Amino acid sequence: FITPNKEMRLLRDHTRSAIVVHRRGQNSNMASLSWEELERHYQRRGNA
Amino acid sequence: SETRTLQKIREATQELLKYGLLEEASKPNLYRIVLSHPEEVTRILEPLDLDIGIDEIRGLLYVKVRLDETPAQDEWAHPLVRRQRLNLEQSLLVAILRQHFVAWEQESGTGASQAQIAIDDLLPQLQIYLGDPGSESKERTRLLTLLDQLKGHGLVTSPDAHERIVIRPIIAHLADPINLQALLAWLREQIAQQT
Amino acid sequence: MNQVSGLAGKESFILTRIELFNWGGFHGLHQAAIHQDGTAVIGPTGSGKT
Amino acid sequence: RKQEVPLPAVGVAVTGIPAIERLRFKEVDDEAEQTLDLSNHAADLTQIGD
Numbered sequence: 151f152i153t154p155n156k157e158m159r160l161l162r163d164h165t166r167s168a169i170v171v172h173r174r175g176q177n178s179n180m181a182s183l184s185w186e187e188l189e190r191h192y193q194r195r196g197n198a
Numbered sequence: 199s200e201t202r203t204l205q206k207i208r209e210a211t212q213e214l215l216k217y218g219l220l221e222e223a224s225k226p227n228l229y230r231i232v233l234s235h236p237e238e239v240t241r242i243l244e245p246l247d248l249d250i251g252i253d254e255i256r257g258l259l260y261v262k263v264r265l266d267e268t269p270a271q272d273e274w275a276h277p278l279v280r281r282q283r284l285n286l287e288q289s290l291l292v293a294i295l296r297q298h299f300v301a302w303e304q305e306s307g308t309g310a311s312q313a314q315i316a317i318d319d320l321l322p323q324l325q326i327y328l329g330d331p332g333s334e335s336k337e338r339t340r341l342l343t344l345l346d347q348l349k350g351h352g353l354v355t356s357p358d359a360h361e362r363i364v365i366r367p368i369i370a371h372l373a374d375p376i377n378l379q380a381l382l383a384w385l386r387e388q389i390a391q392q393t
Numbered sequence: 394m395n396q397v398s399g400l401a402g403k404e405s406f407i408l409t410r411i412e413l414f415n416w417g418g419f420h421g422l423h424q425a426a427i428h429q430d431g432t433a434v435i436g437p438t439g440s441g442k443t
Numbered sequence: 444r445k446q447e448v449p450l451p452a453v454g455v456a457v458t459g460i461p462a463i464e465r466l467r468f469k470e471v472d473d474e475a476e477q478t479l480d481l482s483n484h485a486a487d488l489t490q491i492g493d
């Protein structure tokens with residue numbers, strides 16, 4: 151599935167890995183992660 | 199005896215095939231007649247896989263290949279229309295003329311009467327990419343022969359009595375204008391890097 | 394969910410990797426791993442998903 | 444012996460119709476270097492807006 155950050159809660163329950171693609175200037179980068187690793191990342195963000 | 203195509207339409211079609219374009223600027227009688235009978239000219243050209251594209255804004259008609267709508271062939275091939283690749287100098291000159299034409303249109307508007315440009319103005323610009331071949335008598339002669347070669351394709355008029363040319367409308371409809379920009383900028387960057 | 398996931402990887406070919414090189418906005422070499430159980434692609438507008 | 448005789452025109456070939464599309468521009472080649480870089484692009488670590 152492709153989605154611009156919509157229905158994230160729904161994808162989380164029927165897929166096991168996400169491909170986070172983000173933009174910086176003219177270049178684009180993609181990083182593949184599991185939902186749980188991204189959860190750990192969000193928990194680190196939670197200390198802010 | 200049998201019906202014959204109207205003399206004026208036959209003349210217009212033969213002219214259009216010979217030179218590849220008509221212009222209200224220099225051939226009003228035929229150009230207007232063609233626009234008043236588009237279905238006749240398009241019927242005449244369709245058996246040959248040719249078809250007129252019309253540019254009402256700039257007052258121009260030009261032939262183009264009428265081949266099938268994006269068939270299995272990704273690029274068209276036609277028996278009569280023999281393709282060409284302009285040599286390097288011709289490409290540079292066409293790119294310079296094209297950017298001059300676009301820059302002028304940006305100000306006076308699309309289809310505005312092109313301003314006459316002097317020969318002296320172009321040699322400094324060709325020098326930017328070709329250097330000095332050895333003398334003015336050589337560079338001016340080269341520029342003149344290049345302009346005469348281009349006039350064959352219809353991109354520029356002949357130098358008038360005072361050594362100024364005018365850019366023809368047909369330059370706007372080149373096959374891939376993006377190529378001119380790319381090569382021109384690339385060579386400019388090359389010279390700027392080497393200097 | 395996994396009771397149905399047994400079909401994937403067993404019966405049919407599953408896309409498990411895509412690799413790009415100077416494709417679109419992806420300069421250099423890149424690669425995305427596709428989980429055999431279904432993958433989502435997320436990112437803000439105009440980030441290269443399409 | 445370079446006069447022009449009044450013989451007819453037969454086998455009149457019509458070719459080279461000057462369609463403006465038929466022109467292609469010069470393909471000046473570049474040979475300075477090569478773009479060997481295919482690093483992993485490890486800068487992709489997640490840092491995205493809130």
Ligand SMILES: Nc1ncnc2c1ncn2[C@@H]1O[C@H](COP(=O)(O)OP(=O)(O)O)[C@@H](O)[C@H]1O
Nearest residue numbers: 152154173417418436437438439440441442443
């Ligand atoms: N070939 C192209 N033509 C037009 N724009 C392009 C092209 N390639 C890249 N772009 C740019 O790069 C991105 C390509 O679209 P994309 O980001 O993949 O859509 P989406 O938002 O669904 O991910 C856009 O930001 C676009 O501006």
